[PDB]
Design a protein around this ligand. Structure first.
Ligand SMILES: Nc1nc2ccccc2s1
Length: 220
């Protein structure tokens, strides 16, 4: 399948990314609290449900939440301000809380079942979010005695995600805090704007994009 792209809502950020976030890829977005990474997550969960002409892939979403940062009311707001139906948009976001790192890995392994079910329907899964990729791993595996196992499990987790992305033509989007992944770093700009910087992309030049957070989620 040809690589599909989902608009982030921001034309500036889309340009930096070569058009939007890619299917068959993991996009990994870093940022401190208030950087805009979870807002970008929420915006993508809406955008992907649009037709390609509007920057989406006519897709469903699966959302794995590790620290209780998913906000249904924010989905509704973004959906409505983009002229969409907030109830329909929310219905097509499948939600799962991950309680710990083992559970998080289990959820990704078993996510394949639902992806298979939706694969040849009108709303195949096109976005899988893990927000956030590392909070549980960082919490559970403390100090140098734990590092080896931590990296092992995380590596396996990322491999499971890459496989789902590649096999089923899904854009995987994960958040983190400071290949395999396309790494984007968010920071505060001036006047409440945010800045994204792309780093170490094999086939996209490094660069920066300034964007805003609005009732539409993110946009220029
Ligand atoms: N195994 C998984 N089931 C679900 C359900 C909703 C969202 C994400 C996931 S991952």
């Amino acid at each position: 399948a040809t690589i599909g792209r989902i608009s982030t809502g921001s034309k500036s950020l889309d340009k930096l990314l070569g058009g939007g976030i890619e299917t068959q890829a993991i996009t990994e977005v870093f940022g401190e609290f208030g950087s805009g990474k979870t807002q970008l997550a929420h915006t993508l969960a809406v955008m992907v449900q649009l037709p390609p002409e509007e920057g989406g892939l006519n897709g469903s979403v699966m959302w794995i939440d590790t620290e209780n940062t998913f906000r249904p009311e924010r989905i509704r707001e973004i959906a409505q301000n983009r002229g969409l139906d907030p109830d329909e948009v929310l219905k097509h976001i499948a939600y799962a809380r991950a309680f710990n790192s083992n559970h998080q890995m289990l959820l990704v392994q078993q996510a394949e079942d639902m992806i298979k079910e939706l694969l040849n329907t009108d709303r195949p899964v096109k976005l899988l979010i893990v927000d956030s990729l590392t909070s549980h791993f960082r919490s559970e595996y403390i100090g140098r005695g734990a590092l080896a196992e931590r990296q092992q499990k995380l590596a396996k987790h990322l491999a499971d995600l890459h496989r789902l992305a590649n096999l089923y033509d899904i854009a995987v989007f994960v958040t983190n805090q400071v290949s395999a992944t396309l790494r984007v770093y968010l920071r505060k700009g001036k006047g409440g704007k945010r800045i994204a910087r792309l780093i170490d992309a094999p086939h996209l030049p490094e660069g920066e994009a300034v964007f805003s957070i609005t009732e539409k989620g993110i946009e220029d």
